[PDB]
């Protein structure tokens, strides 16, 4: 579509936060759209990337790939600028063949969006307990 | 958590379809939980796997990993039983460190559930258009 600004609402555990994202332009080397947090210095902000691939002589099917990262800033004593302590990652990758229809690809996207709010994947992700 | 039926609602491009996933036990060889649909033939089932791996002496990070496999079926000329023609995969990997609090882990879970329902990502997955 078009790289616009993205306001993510009802985000967070309590579900009252927002995360606004301004576009940062595609990359001519790889064709990867990029976004970043609205108001932060570079290399201390929350990043979202997305890239769609076509078939080639290597791979016979499509490939959509989202990849988000978000650091944590620790303002140490005796320094004006914060450092990063740790990253947290999540990289989705979809795979659809060339004869897949529109309602098969939208079924995967909406199943995954509805599955991340289930008590199987709440307790697996923010609590790190496996499923028994 | 504990494996029970994860009945997901409001699925689809329109948003009226549901899907119930019946549990199929945990594999002890690699610690991968398993949900599946209610088909009789095992190759026509929509199955979901999920596994979180402890940090060993090599990887040092926790790693939640969710997979989704949706086959479609159709019978051909001179054939009786339906075969499997396409596969629409999905593959989400999370990655956190030892010192991440649970609010950092719940931000990434609810951010990814909110990106998948945004008009930038429902156009790259349903229509297969790079963000331009």
């Amino acid at each position, epitope marked *: 579509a078009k790289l616009e600004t993205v306001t993510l609402g*009802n985000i*967070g*555990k*309590d*579900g*009252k936060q927002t995360l606004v994202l301004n576009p940062r332009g595609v990359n001519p080397t790889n064709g990867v759209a990029s976004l970043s947090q609205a108001g932060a210095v570079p290399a201390l902000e929350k990043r979202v990337t997305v890239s769609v691939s076509q078939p080639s002589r290597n791979r016979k099917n499509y490939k959509v790939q989202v990849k988000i990262q978000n650091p944590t800033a620790c303002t140490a004593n005796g320094s004006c600028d914060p450092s990063v302590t740790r990253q947290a990652y999540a990289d989705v990758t979809f795979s659809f063949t060339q004869y897949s229809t529109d309602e098969e690809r939208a079924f995967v996207r909406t199943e995954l969006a*509805a599955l991340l*709010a*289930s*008590p*199987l994947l*709440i*307790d697996a992700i923010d*609590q790190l*307990n496996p499923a028994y | *958590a*504990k494996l*029970e*039926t*994860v*009945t*997901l*609602g*409001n699925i689809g491009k329109d948003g009226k379809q*549901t899907l119930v996933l019946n549990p199929r036990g945990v594999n002890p060889t690699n610690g991968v939980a398993s949900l599946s649909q209610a088909g009789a033939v095992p190759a026509l089932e929509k199955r979901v796997t999920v596994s979180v791996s402890q940090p060993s002496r090599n990887r040092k990070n926790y790693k939640v990993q969710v997979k989704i496999q949706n086959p479609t079926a159709c019978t051909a000329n001179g054939s009786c039983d339906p075969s499997v023609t396409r596969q629409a995969y999905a593959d989400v990997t999370f990655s956190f460190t030892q010192y991440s609090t649970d609010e950092e882990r719940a931000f990434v879970r609810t951010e990814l559930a909110a990106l998948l329902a945004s008009p930038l990502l429902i156009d790259a997955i349903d229509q297969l258009n790079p963000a331009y």
Partner: nanobody
Amino acid sequence: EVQLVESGGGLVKSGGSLKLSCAASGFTFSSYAMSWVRQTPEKRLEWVATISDGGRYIYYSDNVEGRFTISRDNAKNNLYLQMSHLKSEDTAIYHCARDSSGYFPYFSYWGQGTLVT
């Protein structure tokens, strides 16, 4: 084991206020949705309210919506129900249920309940 030990109850005249609770031990309380389910002395079961995982999405019934609120505390593992205006029909037992993994619940586990008048 999944256990839901309620508290509160008693003899309260009309127009008053109450607060119930639910102990909710034996499982990760902050992963599952919760519910209040009532049972009249005429022995019919009715639904009161649901609250989601983080307390974000809340569904009430028609005879509850104007005057009750529901809340939860994921650090103390409690599940509350503030009451008001007590219009002489709610004299139930008020079971505390654990919601199923899903989009609308089907009440897998239950509890003893507290008599209110």
